[PDB]
Design a protein around this ligand. Structure first.
Ligand SMILES: *[C@@H]1O[C@H](CO)[C@@H](O[C@@H]2O[C@H](CO)[C@@H](O[C@@H]3O[C@H](CO)[C@@H](O)[C@H](O)[C@@H]3O)[C@H](O)[C@H]2NC(C)=O)[C@H](O)[C@H]1NC(C)=O
Ligand SMILES: *[C@@H]1O[C@H](CO)[C@@H](O[C@@H]2O[C@H](CO)[C@@H](O)[C@H](O)[C@H]2NC(C)=O)[C@H](O)[C@H]1NC(C)=O
Ligand SMILES: *[C@@H]1O[C@H](CO)[C@@H](O[C@@H]2O[C@H](CO)[C@@H](O)[C@H](O)[C@H]2NC(C)=O)[C@H](O)[C@H]1NC(C)=O
Ligand SMILES: *[C@@H]1O[C@H](CO)[C@@H](O[C@@H]2O[C@H](CO)[C@@H](O)[C@H](O)[C@H]2NC(C)=O)[C@H](O)[C@H]1NC(C)=O
Ligand SMILES: OC[C@@H]1O[C@@H](O)[C@H](O)[C@H]1O
Ligand SMILES: [Cl-]
Length: 627
């Protein structure tokens, strides 16, 4: 096919076109992006005196463990304590371990920060060292530090100890430990609460993020971060919804919540930590507010909304408000960030098409209130576009689609026929998730993708060329889900996967990265691809530099030739760069082969005419300079 490139741009490409979608799913927050290494660190939202309250915790030697409703808890938010009892007659090493989130990476190049709170409920004569550390799951100690404690300490006391491993572990099958001398401790009980173990964090942020994952997200050049959901915003019930205020301040005062994917969220990754990450990466937020619906099917009545609308206002004021004018903004200032953060986009609920009966009044009441307080924010509706009819008329809709790879290339013209009437569209969740059109949300045996494939990424890339062509009305687009702990998965496929020690960048991740990093501010119209065809392209140009990015998706099984005609330009560089992602149709990056499919960069001859053969199942970016 001959592709003629117009020199005259048709529209400005939004700064926001490519970004990320985040919720805590697949242990993407706790166990993932949030750097805390101990699972069930503070016994949040568990039932005292149950086995499940002890999840991730194990005795050393003859230690007796129970999670109790402490008569004197460390805080109101953390009513549960670990009761650690040493039997009479004990000796040697007695204590307990935490297995982490399916392991803990122990790296001698890292300093770890351990902490805990303790008290003796019964004043005792105990006088001896409390040791914390890291051990292999065979009990081989790799790091340790200690401090003196006294049985007379009957009020909560924090211990803070650094840990320096003597050797890196050969795998992630390691645990955190706490021990005392069994003879010194014989017959005694200690209550513990609010444990933590951190590695070095991204940008050395206090209470920050896991470095390899954070860097991987930054590597993709995202422009926005949609958060905190997604389903995990909604709760199963009003009472279990995400609440911003429960996520800010001291970790002692964060109660955690049962999230929407089968596990407790600590809310250690809370609103301020999200905002700091955006500062650290240059992303801007697309922040959701809870909108009166939860996943059990309950809509709050219209005459019930006011306190929830106020909570949304409070949430936004925490982000952007003048500290002198609201308590949430004063709180932001008091936590060390008096300056407002950026916030241009707020999403009202999540997937309210499932609650489209009540969304008209919820949308109306939330948006009229929020727009009145925040006249510069653009509010995004979550129902299906234009059905039901909302008031006020939405400026934006969030469109989600989970489909087959084929659907994505067949639907690259999704936005071409939309009216240009002042509405913008956020493709806030999309992914090619299955090869089985008859059972998209099924099992792997029934065609569900365990990991993105070259087929899925190239189908998505074809669709993305349509997002970029239609970026006069498409302002933002994010794959979902973003992150997956391979040891605790509720949804596949996911953009980036990991275990306790390493990261897997998917085929889809590379398609995302190639689109986001090679994106000009000008859209250059070109010969249209065949609507329904497997071969797609989109061309943009950087106004300041003339860097011109030709993005090509071949989502099909046939190689396809493209001849590019740039004769309208005064000049075209004599060479360009080629970045190509390709491989067998069903190839994936997996924990066992994490670099099976990676992009390749080379230099090609260019000018006013050049020919490229786009391989079967490929994403290609050709970069030339044009003036
Ligand atoms: C985060 O902020 C919200 C908003 O203040 C807090 O939620 C509020 O919590 C109070 C205390 O639970 C709720 O009050 C109770 O209301 C019911 C029935 O209307 C009544 O039976 C009780 O005696 C009591 O008055 C209040 O309704 C609730 N508001 C909302 C919007 O949920 C929340 O507790 C804060 N979270 C943290 C961790 O600080
Ligand atoms: C045990 O932990 C303590 C407390 O973290 C470590 O002492 C700290 O060391 C850092 C680095 O020198 C200092 O910045 C802090 O001021 C120290 N605090 C205290 C209270 O001493 C100590 O180095 C650790 N020891 C081992 C063997 O890991
Ligand atoms: C932008 O264009 C779309 C497409 O015509 C409009 O969508 C229609 O909206 C009405 C209600 O307002 C519905 O009854 C139609 O089904 C919608 N059409 C389609 C194809 O979805 C939308 O109203 C326009 N918006 C503005 C702001 O002018
Ligand atoms: C976490 O997941 C990883 C990856 O799936 C598991 O490691 C794999 O385990 C299977 C079955 O034992 C092996 O055949 C693979 O060779 C392993 N892959 C790699 C890359 O090591 C790991 O065992 C899981 N961890 C836990 C605690 O369940
Ligand atoms: O990305 C996974 C889920 O898909 C959509 O149903 C939900 O918003 C999201 O939580
Ligand atoms: Cl398919």
């Amino acid at each position: 096919v001959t592709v003629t490139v117009n020199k005259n741009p048709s529209h400005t490409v939004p700064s926001t076109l490519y970004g990320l979608m985040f919720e805590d799913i697949n242990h993407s927050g706790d166990g993932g992006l949030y750097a805390e290494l101990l699972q069930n660190r503070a016994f949040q939202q568990v039932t005292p005196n149950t086995a499940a309250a002890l999840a991730a915790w194990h005795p050393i030697s003859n230690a007796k463990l129970a999670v109790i409703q402490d008569p004197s808890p460390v805080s109101n938010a953390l009513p549960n304590s670990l009761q650690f009892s040493v039997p009479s007659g004990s000796s040697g090493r007695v204590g307990f371990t935490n297995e982490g989130f399916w392991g803990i990476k122990v790296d001698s190049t890292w300093t770890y920060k351990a902490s805990l709170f303790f008290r003796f409920p019964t004043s005792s004569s105990f006088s001896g060292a409390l040791t914390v550390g890291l051990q292999t799951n065979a009990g081989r100690v790799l790091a340790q530090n200690s401090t003196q404690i006294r049985g007379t300490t009957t009020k909560w006391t924090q211990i803070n100890l650094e840990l320096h491993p003597t050797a890196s572990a050969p795998d992630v099958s390691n645990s955190f430990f706490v021990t005392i001398d069994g003879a010194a401790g014989a017959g005694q009980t200690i209550n513990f609460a609010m444990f933590s173990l951190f590695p070095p964090t991204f940008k050395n942020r206090p209470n920050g993020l896991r470095a390899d994952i954070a860097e991987t997200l930054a590597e993709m050049g995202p422009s926005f971060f949609r958060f905190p959901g997604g389903n995990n915003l909604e709760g199963q019930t009003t009472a279990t919804r995400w609440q911003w205020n429960a996520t800010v301040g001291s970790l002692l005062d964060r109660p955690g919540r049962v999230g929407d994917w089968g596990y407790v969220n600590t809310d250690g990754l809370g609103l301020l930590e999200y905002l700091q990450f955006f500062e650290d990466t240059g992303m801007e937020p697309i922040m959701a507010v809870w909108a009166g619906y939860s996943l059990g099917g309950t809509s709050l009545a219209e005459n019930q909304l006011a306190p929830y609308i106020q909570q949304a206002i409070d949430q936004i004021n925490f982000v952007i408000g003048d500290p002198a004018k609201s308590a949430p903004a004063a709180l932001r200032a008091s936590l060390g960030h008096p300056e407002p953060f950026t916030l241009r986009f707020v999403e009202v609920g999540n997937e309210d098409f499932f609650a489209a009966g009540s969304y008209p009044y919820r949308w109306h009441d939330f948006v009229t209130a929020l727009q009145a307080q925040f006249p510069q924010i653009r509010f995004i509706a979550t129902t299906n576009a234009w059905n039901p009819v909302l008031s006020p008329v939405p400026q934006s809709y969030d469109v989600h689609v989970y489909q087959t790879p084929t659907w994505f290339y067949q639907n690259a013209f999704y936005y071409d026929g939309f009216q240009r009437n002042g509405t913008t569209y956020f493709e806030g969740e999309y992914a090619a998730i299955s090869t089985n059109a008859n059972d998209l949300f099924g099992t792997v045996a029934d065609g569900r993708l365990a990991f993105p494939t070259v087929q899925s990424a190239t189908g998505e890339a074809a669709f993305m060329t349509g997002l970029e062509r239609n970026s006069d009305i498409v302002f933002a687009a994010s794959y979902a889900p973003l992150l997956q702990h391979v040891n605790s998965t509720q949804w596949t496929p996911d953009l980036v996967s990991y275990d306790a020690g390493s990261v897997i960048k998917s085929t889809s991740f590379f398609a995302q990265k190639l689109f986001a990093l090679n994106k000009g501010d000008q859209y250059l119209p070109s010969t249209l691809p065949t609507n329904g065809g497997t071969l797609h392209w989109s061309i943009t140009r950087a106004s300041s530099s003339g860097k011109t990015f030709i993005k090509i998706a071949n989502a099909g099984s046939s190689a396809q030739s493209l001849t590019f005609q740039l004769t309208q330009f005064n000049s075209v560089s004599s060479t360009g760069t080629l970045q190509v992602l390709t491989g067998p149709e069903t190839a994936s990056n997996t924990p066992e082969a994490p670099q099976a499919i990676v992009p390749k960069t080379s230099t090609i001859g260019t000018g006013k005419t050049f020919t490229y053969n786009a391989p079967a199942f490929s994403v290609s970016v050709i970069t030339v300079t044009t003036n």
